[PDB]
């Protein structure tokens, strides 16, 4: 069209518009005030009516990038402020949006932000709901200059849902409380994959990428054909690098042209894209993101005909290496939707070490004969691991389960933080209760989407402040091994324990009239420095100390005087587990 702004205006729409173009602003002018975001906006937003008025209206005819950066020069106290980030001014496009692009600070040096009062919450939103949520969105985009754009819109409205369904409650916090909650966590969760996805393409390289990517494209769609799957996992690369670089307008263009692209090659994909596709332009990328595995055609061969019988297998494989690779992932993905896609990748990998250690020698056909027999224990390894931890954590609830896991990693890693061990197996405490409650077919493709942002954070915070060559080794592993690594700790064996320390045993009522999740946080922290000062104690022996301590806290916060039988019955539990765990 003659004019980029009045076309993004028109399918966009005035309101999405106006916040998107806040969101943009603010995750590059990540120091301006919200009321200096709130004119540029006012201002790009009455340009662009008036281009919607007249095409040819002057400057309608420049680009976004070009219109973005001259209004972005267009801060006064850009360089006072900003600095380096002026002298972008200097130069002309494309070298000024790039320029720009490079000094957006990741983790930028911002407050935390609150959680304000339910009350003064719900008081905000009714006297002006609109600069309530366009305030918010801003701190939020500011703090978070990576999150696509149209992603955090999607969030704010099931932000508003939320204070439109809870404010008018009877009981506003009970309806409010946890949906922010699942709100945030859902964010966080969502920013984590963002960033996790990125780095993975940085450190492994696109085959990997794309290997992870047949994996997944193919249970979803499985009666796609091999070669449409080839096709979007291809531009579905294209997409996360682009978006990875961090240009908004670059990134949300390549994800509209193949949102539209599976659309139009709808029945040649999935059935379920029906929704999806019918949703508008803003919207589509998201659903589609998010639908539903397909269900597969039942009428499927057997893959052992193809990879493990037919003696044109090493030819095959020698024409194309990667290409009969991925077929083999194509064709073992989509008839297993209850696979992790890292379960796909490693019989991926078995299966190749076992193409080239076998097509390389005599008979072929005989030396790979049996591998599908290698693969079972494979599959099997993580479906233990679910059953048997799915089990006990019906046995116990969320909390005692999380217990049982923070004596059972702290013995493996007495080195790590407390705080840090407690974080940790809280989060996969929940993990168990999120993904339990499915049916056997989904419960491993739950665990991995979990689990790889948990196992993620973790390696982070200890790439900081490394504490142990063993989670540091699993850290730095390939993203298939990761998981598995993990599971292979052992009880740490050379581990000195810590002294006694009367303070960390030491407990006064206040504990009586705290939240559960801060008595818990209280106990769960305890039980830490617990095992790290007796870590060859039982499961029995501390079963007995728990209990001594369980009902210890009822008969000190349910005595006319607390204080003094926290510290009178505090004395004898102390002297007395002592003894026990000798
Ligand atoms: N430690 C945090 C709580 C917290 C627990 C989990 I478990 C978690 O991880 C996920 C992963 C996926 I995938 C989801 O869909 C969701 I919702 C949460 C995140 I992020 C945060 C705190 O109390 O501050
Ligand atoms: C996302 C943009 C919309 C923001 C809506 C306001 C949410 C309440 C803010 C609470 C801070 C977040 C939290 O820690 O729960
Ligand atoms: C469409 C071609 C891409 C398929 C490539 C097949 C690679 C299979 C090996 C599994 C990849 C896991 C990543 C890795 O360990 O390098
Ligand atoms: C300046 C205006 C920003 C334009 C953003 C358009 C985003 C389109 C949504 C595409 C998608 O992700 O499916
Ligand atoms: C996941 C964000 C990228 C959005 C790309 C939309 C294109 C449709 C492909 C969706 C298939 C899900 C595969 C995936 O998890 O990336
Ligand atoms: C607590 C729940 C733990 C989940 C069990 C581990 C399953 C991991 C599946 C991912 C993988 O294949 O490595
Ligand atoms: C520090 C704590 C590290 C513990 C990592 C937990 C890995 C989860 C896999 C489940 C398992 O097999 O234990
Ligand atoms: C040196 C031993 C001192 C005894 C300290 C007791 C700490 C154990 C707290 C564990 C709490 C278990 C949680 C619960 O009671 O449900």
Redesign the pocket.
């Given at each position: 069209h003659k004019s980029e702004v009045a076309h993004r205006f028109k399918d966009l729409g005035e309101e999405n518009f106006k916040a998107l173009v806040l969101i943009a602003f603010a995750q590059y002018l990540q120091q301006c005030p919200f009321e200096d975001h709130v004119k540029l906006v006012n201002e790009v937003t009455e340009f662009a009516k008036t281009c919607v008025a007249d095409e040819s209206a002057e400057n309608c005819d420049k680009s976004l990038h070009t219109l973005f950066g001259d209004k972005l020069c267009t801060v006064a106290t850009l360089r006072e402020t900003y600095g380096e980030m002026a002298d972008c001014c200097a130069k002309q496009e494309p070298e000024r949006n790039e320029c720009f692009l490079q000094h957006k600070d990741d983790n930028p040096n911002l407050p935390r932000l609150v959680r304000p009062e339910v009350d003064v919450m719900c008081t905000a939103f009714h006297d002006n709901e609109e600069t309530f949520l366009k305030k918010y969105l801003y701190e939020i985009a500011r703090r978070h200059p990576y999150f696509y754009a149209p992603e955090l819109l999607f969030f704010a409205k099931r932000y508003k849902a939320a204070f439109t369904e809870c404010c008018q409650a009877a009981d506003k916090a009970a309806c409010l409380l946890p949906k922010l909650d699942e709100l945030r966590d859902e964010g966080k969760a969502s920013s984590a994959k963002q960033r996790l996805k990125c780095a993975s393409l940085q450190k492994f390289g696109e085959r990997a990428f794309k290997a992870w990517?047949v994996a997944?494209?193919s249970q979803?769609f499985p009666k796609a054909e091999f070669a449409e799957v080839s096709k979007?996992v291809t531009d579905?690369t294209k997409?996360?690098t682009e978006?990875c670089h961090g240009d908004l307008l670059e990134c949300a263009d390549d994800?509209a042209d193949?949102?539209k692209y599976?659309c139009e090659n709808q029945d040649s994909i999935s059935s379920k894209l029906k929704e999806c596709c019918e949703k508008p332009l803003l919207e589509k990328?998201?659903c589609?993101?998010e639908?539903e595995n397909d269900e597969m055609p039942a009428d499927l061969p057997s893959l052992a005909a193809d990879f493990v019988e037919s003696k044109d297998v090493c030819k095959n494989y020698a024409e194309a290496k990667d290409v009969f690779l991925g077929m083999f992932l194509y064709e073992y993905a989509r008839r297993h939707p209850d696979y992790s896609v890292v379960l796909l990748l490693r019989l991926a990998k078995t299966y190749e070490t076992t193409l080239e250690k076998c097509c390389a020698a005599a008979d072929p056909h005989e030396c790979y004969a049996k591998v599908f027999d290698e693969f079972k224990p494979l599959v099997e390894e993580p479906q233990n691991l679910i059953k048997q931890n799915c089990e006990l954590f019906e046995q116990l609830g969320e909390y005692k389960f999380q217990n049982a896991l923070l004596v059972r990693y702290t013995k493996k890693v007495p080195q790590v933080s407390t705080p840090t061990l407690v974080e940790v197996s809280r989060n996969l405490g929940k993990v168990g209760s999120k993904c339990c409650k499915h049916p056997e077919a989904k419960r491993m493709p739950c665990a991995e989407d979990y689990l790889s942002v948990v196992l993620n954070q973790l390696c982070v915070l200890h790439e900081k402040t490394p504490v142990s060559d063993r989670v540091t080794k699993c850290c730095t592993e390939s993203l298939v091994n990761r998981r598995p690594c993990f599971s292979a700790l052992e009880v740490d064996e050379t581990y000195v324990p810590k002294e006694f320390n009367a303070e960390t045993f030491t407990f006064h009522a206040d504990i009586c009239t705290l939240s559960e999740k801060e008595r818990q946080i209280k106990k769960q922290t305890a039980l830490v420095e617990l095992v790290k000062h007796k870590p060859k104690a039982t499961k029995e022996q501390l079963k007995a100390v728990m209990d001594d301590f369980a009902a210890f806290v009822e008969k000190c916060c349910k005595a006319d005087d607390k204080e003094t039988c926290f510290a009178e019955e505090g004395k004898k539990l102390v002297a007395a587990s002592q003894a026990a765990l000798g």
């Open positions: 990517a997944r494209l979803r979007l579905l997409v996360h978006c994800r193949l949102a599976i990328s998201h589609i993101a639908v």
